[PDB]
Enzyme design. Structure first.
Site, mmCIF file in Angstrom:
data_model
loop_
_atom_site.group_PDB
_atom_site.id
_atom_site.type_symbol
_atom_site.label_atom_id
_atom_site.label_comp_id
_atom_site.label_asym_id
_atom_site.label_seq_id
_atom_site.Cartn_x
_atom_site.Cartn_y
_atom_site.Cartn_z
ATOM 1 C CG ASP A 10 -5.494 -0.250 15.806
ATOM 2 O OD1 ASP A 10 -4.346 0.061 15.660
ATOM 3 O OD2 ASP A 10 -6.397 0.533 16.228
ATOM 4 C CG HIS A 27 5.082 -3.063 11.117
ATOM 5 N ND1 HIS A 27 5.716 -1.960 10.642
ATOM 6 C CD2 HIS A 27 3.971 -2.682 11.877
ATOM 7 C CE1 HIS A 27 5.324 -0.990 11.251
ATOM 8 N NE2 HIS A 27 4.288 -1.293 11.482
ATOM 9 C CG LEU A 103 -10.096 -17.132 2.517
ATOM 10 C CD1 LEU A 103 -11.422 -17.256 3.341
ATOM 11 C CD2 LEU A 103 -9.053 -17.131 3.240
#
Ligand SMILES: CCCCCCOc1cccc(CCCNC(=O)/C=C(\O)C(=O)O)c1
Lengths: 205, 211
Positions: A10, A27, A103
């Site tokens: 956030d 963004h 990962l």
């Protein structure tokens, strides 16, 4: 050691506003913070990293790159409404990286923790209807087998940036025993020292 | 009420650590912790909270009902036990049922006590109930949505949980409420549970109102 970190990303909107710039600008520095956090997780032997955008067409360009880094990409969440060309892009991206052993990177897209549980409930309900399962046979482990990420290490640590102190219907079932780590740092600014600050919190518990 | 807070849930941890700091056995932490339970209940009851849900963190210490039930009733508090009560021994089951029955007509704070409660189990028993209705062909699998499962989890008829407090310094839910805290404020304090007083509680309510 920390095996599986989930991050609520956030603060992109607040960040942009602070810099007297529009959403678009936040963004884009957010996407930069995604790459650094991905890279930090891969270089530090974390098994799984799960990212929730809180404050997809831009993942086409990053996939070839993740593949070479031995990263297995998965999208969790309800992708059934999504137009079918994007559904098939997501499918090809997943397929392309599925045999990778480094990962596992989970991207929650149109995800809700309640939705996640319900979709698993729906599946057991189909089984019950069919005659394949008695009500009293349903236990925690069986419901676990039908919620997102049951094949991964359990979530050890949830990080939320941006100052709020809530899960906001991210993972619910999965975080029964996770360390929660809340920071005021806004997502575009969260760097390697913030990330390690959070792994510290987990080690101290 | 000004603070905005209808339903508070508390993970009451730090009692063990509180006794150890004093150089006392655990029993003294449990006594000190029980006093702080009574203080948090009174405070919730006098500050307009609708619901207070406590996670206490053999068992027959739980026969602390019979210490408190008369008192709760006299504070107009409605008592309810949440959790898997089915494996409890018949007379304990009746002391619970009677305790609940005695206070059901009370109109002040609703006080929920977690006893052999887990958030996962909670979700799992709601799914059982739904699976029964599927099998006893009342229900279509594709009719099951969030609102429906929501009506089968504990405390569905109460105000949603606005605020979770955990004392004692750890930052985890530990399988307390899960479904129900999707949108709750989480407040962690290092204050150990026996030391957590009205001002600390007031502290948590104000930070909730400010956030
Ligand atoms: C009103 C009806 C009774 C409520 C049910 C429980 O009644 C209680 C009695 C006495 C004390 C408490 C305080 C919490 C117990 N302590 C811990 O769980 C301590 C740890 O987990 C830890 O120290 O790590 C609760």
């Amino acid at each position: 050691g920390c095996r599986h970190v989930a991050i609520i990303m956030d603060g992109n909107g607040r960040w942009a506003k602070k810099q007297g710039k529009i959403r678009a600008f936040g963004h884009k520095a957010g996407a930069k913070s995604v790459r650094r956090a991905v890279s930090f997780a891969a270089n530090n032997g974390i098994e799984a990293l799960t990212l929730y955008a809180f404050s997809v067409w831009a993942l086409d360009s990053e996939v070839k790159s993740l593949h070479r880094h031995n990263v297995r990409l998965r999208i969790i969440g309800d992708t059934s409404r999504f137009n079918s060309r994007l559904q098939e892009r997501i499918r090809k991206s997943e397929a392309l990286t599925a045999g990778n052993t480094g990962l596992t990177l989970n991207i929650a897209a149109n995800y809700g923790g309640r939705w996640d549980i319900v979709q698993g409930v729906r599946q057991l309900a189909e089984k019950v209807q069919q005659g394949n399962l008695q009500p009293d046979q349903i236990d925690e482990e069986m419901l676990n087998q039908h919620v997102c990420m049951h094949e991964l290490a359990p979530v050890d640590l949830v990080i939320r940036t941006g100052g709020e102190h809530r899960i906001s219907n991210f993972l619910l079932w999965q975080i029964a025993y996770a360390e929660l780590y809340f920071t005021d740092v806004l997502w575009p600014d969260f760097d390697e020292q913030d990330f390690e600050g959070a792994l510290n919190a987990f080690a101290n518990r």
